[PDB]
C-alpha cells in the first residue's frame, strides 16, 4: 500500500493567519494519463463526517471557500488555509487514489488561537437518587475557557483527592474558540456521607487567583 504521512500532527494558528499542512506519499501519486496528482484533502469538523475540500491536489470542490488551496506534486503536497476563520477548526486528512487500495494520512488537528478566557466554574452535588444506589458522583464544570490547560482539584473536607476523579474535555468550539471541561469525583455512598465540605478548585491563566466552588453536604 502507499503510505500517506502528514506533518505536523497538530498545530495552533491565529485567526486571519495562514495554516500550512503537509502530506507526503511513500511513492508518487501522479497519474500519467492526465498528469494529475491523485490526491485529495478532507476536513472533519467536530461532531461531523468528513467533507471534501480539494481533489487532483489543487482543484477546490464546488463551493469550498477561496481561502483553501492545495499545491504540490508527485510525493509532496500541501493544504494551505489562508485568512483562517473560526469555523476552520477541524482535523484535516489527505488521501491518495493513484494506487489500489485507496489510503489516507493520519490527520492533522488544527486548533485556533485566541486571547485568554477564564472558565466559569459550577458545581453539582450528587443526586439523592444516585446515593441511594451506593455511589456519589460530584461534578465540577469549567465552561468556555482558553487555553485548554487548567488545574482542577477536588477537596473533600479540605483533603486533596487523587485517583478518584475523571476529566473530560470538549473539542474546541468554533463559536468562541473555547473548551469546556467536566471533572467527576466518584465516591462510595459511605465515604460521601463521612464528609461534609466538597470543593472544586480551579487554576487557569485567565484567573488572577484560583476559584473555589464548594458546598456543604445536606445544607441548601
Amino acid at each position: 500500500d502507499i503510505v500517506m504521512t502528514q506533518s505536523p500532527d497538530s498545530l495552533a494558528v491565529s485567526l486571519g493567519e495562514r495554516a500550512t499542512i503537509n502530506c507526503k506519499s511513500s511513492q508518487s501519486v501522479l497519474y500519467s494519463s492526465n498528469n494529475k496528482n491523485y490526491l485529495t484533502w478532507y476536513q472533519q469538523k467536530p461532531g461531523q463526517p468528513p467533507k471534501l475540500l480539494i481533489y487532483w491536489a489543487s482543484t477546490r470542490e464546488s463551493g469550498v471557500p477561496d481561502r483553501f488551496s492545495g499545491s504540490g506534486s508527485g510525493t509532496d503536497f500541501t493544504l494551505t488555509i489562508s485568512s483562517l476563520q473560526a469555523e476552520d477548526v477541524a482535523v484535516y486528512y489527505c488521501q491518495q487514489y493513484d494506487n489500489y487500495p485507496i489510503t489516507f494520512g493520519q490527520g492533522t488537528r488544527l486548533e485556533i488561537k485566541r486571547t485568554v478566557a477564564a472558565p466559569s466554574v459550577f458545581i453539582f452535588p450528587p443526586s439523592d437518587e444516585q446515593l441511594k444506589s451506593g455511589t456519589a458522583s460530584v461534578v465540577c464544570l469549567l465552561n468556555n475557557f482558553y487555553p485548554r490547560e487548567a488545574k482542577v482539584q477536588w477537596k473533600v473536607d479540605n483533603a486533596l483527592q487523587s485517583g478518584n476523579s475523571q476529566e473530560s474535555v470538549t473539542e474546541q468550539d468554533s463559536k468562541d474558540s473555547t473548551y469546556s471541561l467536566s471533572s467527576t469525583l466518584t465516591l462510595s455512598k459511605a465515604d460521601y456521607e463521612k464528609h461534609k465540605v466538597y470543593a472544586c478548585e480551579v487554576t487557569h491563566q485567565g484567573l488572577s487567583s484560583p476559584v473555589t466552588k464548594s458546598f456543604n453536604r445536606g445544607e441548601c
Partner: protein
C-alpha cells in the same frame, strides 16, 4: 441536495456478522460509486471496498477480501456492507461515501477516486460484553451553578455500554449553550458522560428542562426532567 443516511449503532459478538445500510435520500446512486471507509480507535481511516451500482461491480481491499460483501439495490438507492467473522479490532465507525469515478484507459476500467458525500457513520462495537442502558441523574441547577443571569444545569448519563448515546434537550428545541462531553470508560467497563447547558437563570422558575438520551445498542431511550434545587 444529496444525503446518505446509515443504519444505527450496533454491538456484536466476536465471530458474528454485521450489515450496515446506507440509503441515498432526495437522491439516487446514478452512475456514482459507493465506498465503505472505517475508522477504528487509534488507527487511520481505512478504505474497505466499494461498488459501482449501475454495473453491479464491487472491489475490496486485500485485508478484508473474503469477509466483506458490498451490495447495492438501485430500486431502493440503498447500499450495504456486510462484515463477517467479526474481531475486536473491527470496532470502528463505518462510513459510506459516494464519489465519482475516472476511467483508466490503460487497464480498461472505472476506478474509485475520492468521496464527495459521506454518510453520518455507524459505530459498530465488537465485544463479548452485553449492551446496557444508561441511568440518568440530574445535574440540578442551584446557587452553586449560577453566575449573574446565567444558570448551568445538566444530566449525568451513567453506566452504559457500548457507545454511543445521543443526548438532546427538550426534544431538540434547546441547542444553544449545550456541551455534551466525551464519554469516559469506567473501571467497571461501562461508559459515563455528562451533558450540560447554560440558560437564563430567570427561566428556572418557568421553563421545563428535559434531557433525552437515546442508546440504540440497548434499545433504550430515557428522558429526565431536571428541576432546581430547593431548601425543601
Amino acid at each position: 441536495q444529496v444525503q446518505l443516511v446509515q443504519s444505527g449503532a450496533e454491538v456484536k459478538k466476536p465471530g458474528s456478522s454485521v450489515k450496515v445500510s446506507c440509503k441515498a435520500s432526495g437522491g439516487t446512486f446514478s452512475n456514482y460509486a459507493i465506498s465503505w471507509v472505517r475508522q477504528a480507535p487509534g488507527q487511520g481511516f481505512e478504505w474497505m471496498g466499494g461498488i459501482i451500482p449501475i454495473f453491479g461491480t464491487a472491489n475490496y481491499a486485500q485485508k478484508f477480501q473474503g469477509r466483506v460483501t458490498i451490495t447495492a439495490d438501485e430500486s431502493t438507492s440503498t447500499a450495504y456492507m456486510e462484515l463477517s467473522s467479526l474481531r475486536s479490532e473491527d470496532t470502528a465507525v463505518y462510513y459510506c461515501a459516494r464519489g465519482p469515478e475516472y476511467y483508466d484507459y490503460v487497464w480498461g476500467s472505472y476506478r474509485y477516486n475520492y468521496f464527495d458525500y459521506w454518510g453520518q457513520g455507524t459505530l459498530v462495537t465488537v465485544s463479548s460484553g452485553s449492551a446496557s442502558a444508561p441511568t440518568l441523574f440530574p445535574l440540578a441547577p442551584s446557587s452553586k451553578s449560577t453566575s449573574g443571569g446565567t444558570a448551568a444545569l445538566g444530566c449525568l448519563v451513567k453506566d452504559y455500554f457500548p457507545e454511543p448515546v445521543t443526548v438532546s434537550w427538550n426534544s431538540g428545541a434547546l441547542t444553544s449553550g449545550v456541551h455534551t462531553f466525551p464519554a469516559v470508560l469506567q473501571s467497571s467497563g461501562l461508559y459515563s458522560l455528562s451533558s450540560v447547558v447554560t440558560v437564563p437563570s430567570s427561566s428556572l422558575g418557568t421553563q421545563t428542562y428535559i434531557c433525552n438520551v437515546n442508546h440504540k445498542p440497548s434499545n433504550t431511550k430515557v428522558d429526565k426532567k431536571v428541576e432546581p434545587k430547593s431548601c425543601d
